[PDB]
């Protein structure tokens, strides 16, 4: 393409460079996702 | 259904380690306590972003150490119904 700087202009958005799948369904799934974490994240006898 | 529901801590980024160490430290002191997922994760999210590179890099460094430890066990790990 001919856009050397032009394709960069919009990347002033809050990004991490976009290398990570960002959860859109919940913010409590942002860091510690339940699937793996529940083994250690919490130690409960049952729901 | 990859599963692997018995993995180690993980290769999680420093971001999750921030929540990880904080949520755990509280749970270690208080075995009677837990946290609210939506609450604690949001508080950590906002707080993390506003921290300095020194602090973020600290969690990043710890993550690197756990990542390598993960790799070590990863080789000796057999995926249960790991499709």
Swiss-Prot record, chain A:
Top-rank taxon: Eukaryota
Reported effect, residue 21 to L: In a sporadic cancer; somatic mutation
Listed name of the protein: Cellular tumor antigen p53
Covalent cross-link Glycyl lysine isopeptide (Lys-Gly) (interchain with G-Cter in ubiquitin) as placed by the record, residue numbers: 11
Function field: Multifunctional transcription factor that induces cell cycle arrest, DNA repair or apoptosis upon binding to its target DNA sequence. Acts as a tumor suppressor in many tumor types; induces growth arrest or apoptosis depending on the physiological circumstances and cell type. Negatively regulates cell division by controlling expression of a set of genes required for this process. One of the activated genes is an inhibitor of cyclin-dependent kinases. Apoptosis induction seems to be mediated either by stimulation of BAX and FAS antigen expression, or by repression of Bcl-2 expression.
Effect the entry attributes to changing residue 33 to F: In sporadic cancers; somatic mutation
Tissue specificity: Ubiquitous. Isoforms are expressed in a wide range of normal tissues but in a tissue-dependent manner. Isoform 2 is expressed in most normal tissues but is not detected in brain, lung, prostate, muscle, fetal brain, spinal cord and fetal liver. Isoform 3 is expressed in most normal tissues but is not detected in lung, spleen, testis, fetal brain, spinal cord and fetal liver. Isoform 7 is expressed in most normal tissues but is not detected in prostate, uterus, skeletal muscle and breast. Isoform 8 is detected only in colon, bone marrow, testis, fetal brain and intestine.
Induction: Up-regulated in response to DNA damage. Isoform 2 is not induced in tumor cells in response to stress.
Region (Transcription activation (acidic)): 1-31
Native source organism of the sequence: Homo sapiens
Impact noted for substituting residue 26 to V: In a sporadic cancer; somatic mutation
Effect of residue 40 to G: In a sporadic cancer; somatic mutation
Family listed: Belongs to the p53 family.
Effect upon mutating residue 47 to Q: In a sporadic cancer; somatic mutation
UniProt-reported outcome of changing residue 24 to P: In a sporadic cancer; somatic mutation
The organism's taxonomic lineage, starting at the top: Eukaryota, Metazoa, Chordata, Craniata, Vertebrata
Domain comment in the entry: The N-terminal and C-terminal disordered regions undergo liquid-liquid phase separation (LLPS) following homotetramerization and activation. Post-translational modifications, such as phosphorylation or lactylation affect the ability to undergo LLPS.
Curated annotation (Swiss-Prot), chain B:
Residues annotated as site: Cleavage: 9-10, 66-67
Disulfide bond positions: 22-44
Induction field: (Microbial infection) Protein levels increase upon infection by human coronavirus SARS-CoV-2.
Binding site for heparin: 1-9
DNA-binding region: 8-78
Cross-link Isoglutamyl lysine isopeptide (Lys-Gln) (interchain with Q-?) per UniProt, renumbered positions: 27, 42-43, 67
Effect of mutating residue 34 to A: Greatly reduces phosphorylation, nuclear localization
Assembly description: Interacts (fully reduced HMGB1) with CXCL12; probably in a 1:2 ratio involving two molecules of CXCL12, each interacting with one HMG box of HMGB1; inhibited by glycyrrhizin. Associates with the TLR4:LY96 receptor complex. Component of the RAG complex composed of core components RAG1 and RAG2, and associated component HMGB1 or HMGB2. Interacts (in cytoplasm upon starvation) with BECN1; inhibits the interaction of BECN1 and BCL2 leading to promotion of autophagy. Interacts with KPNA1; involved in nuclear import. Interacts with SREBF1, TLR2, TLR4, TLR9, PTPRZ1, APEX1, FEN1, POLB, TERT.
Role, per record: Multifunctional redox sensitive protein with various roles in different cellular compartments. In the nucleus is one of the major chromatin-associated non-histone proteins and acts as a DNA chaperone involved in replication, transcription, chromatin remodeling, V(D)J recombination, DNA repair and genome stability. Proposed to be an universal biosensor for nucleic acids. Promotes host inflammatory response to sterile and infectious signals and is involved in the coordination and integration of innate and adaptive immune responses.
Protein known as: High mobility group protein B1
Taxonomic classification: Eukaryota, Metazoa, Chordata, Craniata, Vertebrata
Gene name, Swiss-Prot/TrEMBL: HMGB1
Included range, full protein: 2 to 84 of 215
């Amino acid at each position: 393409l001919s856009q050397e700087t032009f394709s960069d202009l919009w990347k002033l958005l809050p990004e991490n460079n976009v290398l990570s799948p960002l959860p859109s369904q919940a913010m409590d799934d942002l860091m510690l996702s339940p699937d793996d974490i529940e083994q250690w994240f919490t130690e409960d006898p049952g729901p | 259904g990859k599963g692997d529901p018995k993995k180690p801590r993980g290769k999680m980024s420093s971001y999750a380690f921030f929540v990880q160490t904080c949520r755990e430290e509280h749970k270690k002191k208080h075995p009677d306590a837990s946290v609210n997922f939506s609450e604690f994760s949001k508080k950590c999210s906002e707080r993390w972003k506003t921290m300095s590179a020194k602090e973020k890099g600290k969690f990043e460094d710890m993550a690197k150490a756990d990542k390598a430890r993960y790799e070590r066990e990863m080789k000796t790990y057999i995926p249960p119904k790991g499709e």
